[PDB]
Amino acid sequence: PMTLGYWNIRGLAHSIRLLLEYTDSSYEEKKYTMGDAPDYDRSQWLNEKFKLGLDFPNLPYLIDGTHKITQSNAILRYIARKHNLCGESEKEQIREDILENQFMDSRMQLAKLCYDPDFEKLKPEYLQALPEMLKLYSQFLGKQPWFLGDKITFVDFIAYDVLERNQVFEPSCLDAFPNLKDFISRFEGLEKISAYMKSSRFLPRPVFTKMAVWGNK
Amino acid sequence: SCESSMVLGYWDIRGLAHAIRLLLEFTDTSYEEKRYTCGEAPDYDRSQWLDVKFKLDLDFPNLPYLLDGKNKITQSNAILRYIARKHNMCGETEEEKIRVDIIENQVMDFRTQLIRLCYSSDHEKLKPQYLEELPGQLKQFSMFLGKFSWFAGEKLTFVDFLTYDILDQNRIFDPKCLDEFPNLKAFMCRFEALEKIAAYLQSDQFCKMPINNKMAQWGNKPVC
Numbered sequence: 001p002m003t004l005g006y007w008n009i010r011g012l013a014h015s016i017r018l019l020l021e022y023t024d025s026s027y028e029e030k031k032y033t034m035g036d037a038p039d040y041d042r043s044q045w046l047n048e049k050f051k052l053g054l055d056f057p058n059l060p061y062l063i064d065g066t067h068k069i070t071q072s073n074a075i076l077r078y079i080a081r082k083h084n085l086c087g088e089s090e091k092e093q094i095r096e097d098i099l100e101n102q103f104m105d106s107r108m109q110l111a112k113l114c115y116d117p118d119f120e121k122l123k124p125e126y127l128q129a130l131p132e133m134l135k136l137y138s139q140f141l142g143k144q145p146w147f148l149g150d151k152i153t154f155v156d157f158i159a160y161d162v163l164e165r166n167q168v169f170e171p172s173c174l175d176a177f178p179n180l181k182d183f184i185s186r187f188e189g190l191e192k193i194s195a196y197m198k199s200s201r202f203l204p205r206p207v208f209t210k211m212a213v214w215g216n217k
Numbered sequence: 218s219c220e221s222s223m224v225l226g227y228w229d230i231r232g233l234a235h236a237i238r239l240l241l242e243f244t245d246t247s248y249e250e251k252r253y254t255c256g257e258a259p260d261y262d263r264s265q266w267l268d269v270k271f272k273l274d275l276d277f278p279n280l281p282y283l284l285d286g287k288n289k290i291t292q293s294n295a296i297l298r299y300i301a302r303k304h305n306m307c308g309e310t311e312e313e314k315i316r317v318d319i320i321e322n323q324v325m326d327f328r329t330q331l332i333r334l335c336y337s338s339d340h341e342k343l344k345p346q347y348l349e350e351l352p353g354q355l356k357q358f359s360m361f362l363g364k365f366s367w368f369a370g371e372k373l374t375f376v377d378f379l380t381y382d383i384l385d386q387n388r389i390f391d392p393k394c395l396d397e398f399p400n401l402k403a404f405m406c407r408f409e410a411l412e413k414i415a416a417y418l419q420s421d422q423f424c425k426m427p428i429n430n431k432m433a434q435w436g437n438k439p440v441c
Contacts, residue, residue, distance in 0.1 A: 074318035097295035
């Protein structure tokens with residue numbers, strides 16, 4: 001079936017795995033292990049990196065028959081279209097586009113922080129700024145069940161990943177925003193998601209690669 | 218006429234809005250532009266933006282932004298996709314769509330490295346590293362393009378505007394970079410040859426726009 005290749009980490013593969021499960025897509029995973037020693041040995045990937053025939057060799061990648069796609073957002077949009085989990089009307093599409101980018105923004109914001117050596121002093125800087133970020137997402141969500149309205153689209157899988165990840169970084173962050181806290185619950189409450197979360201194939205952590213200051217391993 | 222006069226707001230810089238301005242021009246989209254100035258002194262005073270920032274009714278206040286009547290968009294790729302969608306300049310077939318989605322995110326990865334290199338204070342010491350790694354990235358773009366007219370295959374889409382912008386900036390940084398890639402060079406000419414693009418590229422205001430904002434360690438001044 002389909003093959004998903006990425007590090008044995010949550011990272012950028014989280015949203016993809018979730019989407020795959022939700023859609024009951026038959027797939028296999030090719031997990032790559034990274035070195036722990038000073039030399040974070042990535043040979044396991046590198047030795048295979050150029051032998052896969054991808055146009056732009058990178059992790060994660062999805063191989064579906066003759067299709068070999070890379071880039072998280074491209075993989076999600078592919079599976080989404082394949083299962084009709086995308087916005088239809090121009091309005092939904094606008095929300096979908098702004099959110100996709102906006103959520104990548106937040107992801108990179110946390111990522112850089114967690115990999116930056118000055119994590120200790122930078123953490124506070126991040127924490128105090130966090131609320132205004134969540135405020136915008138809460139307001140945008142409003143009283144809707146899902147970000148694109150009543151229908152759950154691929155954008156929600158990006159949302160869950162970044163929001164839930166921030167919550168593990170700081171449990172109380174979503175308290176002041178019950179709106180967003182209920183989202184996570186509702187999402188994890190989906191039959192296929194809950195089932196997958198009971199499965200050994202879950203892998204919720206580590207968050208980042210072994211060379212991150214926070215959430216490594 | 219269309220007379221939409223949708224307002225495009227961004228700094229008085231080429232930067233991210235370059236691909237958007239080009240797309241608007243190409244598709245004959247009637248628009249009005251709002252340029253924000255920055256401080257040149259050590260205190261890069263960006264209050265000009267900050268004053269109106271929370272008064273534009275944007276769900277996520279940011280730059281650039283596009284106000285098309287009841288539709289207010291932010292995030293570059295969302296703006297490009299929006300305008301392009303209205304003119305069917307996105308992939309029509311599953312194969313074209315895949316290419317578009319890969320390119321869009323790929324040029325993002327590429328551009329980020331450049332921005333980082335150009336804005337960083339260590340711009341000089343980092344400069345060589347970027348260059349020694351540059352041909353590899355350009356290589357992949359040539360390999361991906363192949364014998365197609367456009368990156369989406371045989372159809373002009375928004376991703377061509379994005380690819381052009383980043384290849385142009387790199388071309389400016391190192392004119393010789395595209396030489397070993399006659400594939401890319403043909404793309405650049407073919408793109409700049411489009412009536413609307415050619416006219417705009419010769420335009421006065423275009424020539425007076427800096428590549429990057431004043432605080433950038435490169436391209437912060439107008440070039441030709």
